[PDB]
Amino acid sequence: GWVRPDLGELSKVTKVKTDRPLPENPYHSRARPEPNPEVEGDLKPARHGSRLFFWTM
């Protein structure tokens, strides 16, 4: 009493219930480096203009 699978049935994707814990780190990745700080704050006007040689603005 075994019925053969139809066309397209053995390629179906199923769900498996098992008792093993999920591996937290399968890739054995090290600690990630600290990211750069993000630019924040309101944009004030430039202090004393261009500050390039003699230019006052």
């Binding site: 750069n36 700080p37 630019v39 202090r47 004393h48 500050r51």
Partner: protein, 63 residues
């Protein structure tokens, strides 16, 4: 012009130029430290973005 007007005009001029000079020196030292350490927003050469990574299960498990 009055001598007092020239006096206080000179003091205002000197204050403005001293502030600009100190800011220029601070800019030079900031640029040097930022280039040496690399942590500031300047001299941030781009690397490869990580949104181009395919995280689906591939056809071979050992990857």
């Amino acid at each position: 012009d009055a001598p007092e007007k020239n006096y206080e005009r000179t003091m205002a001029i000197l204050q403005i130029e001293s502030e600009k000079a100190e800011l220029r020196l601070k800019e030079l030292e900031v640029r040097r430290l930022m280039r040496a350490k690399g942590d500031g927003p300047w001299f941030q050469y781009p690397t490869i973005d990580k949104a181009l990574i395919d995280h689906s299960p591939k056809a071979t498990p050992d990857n």
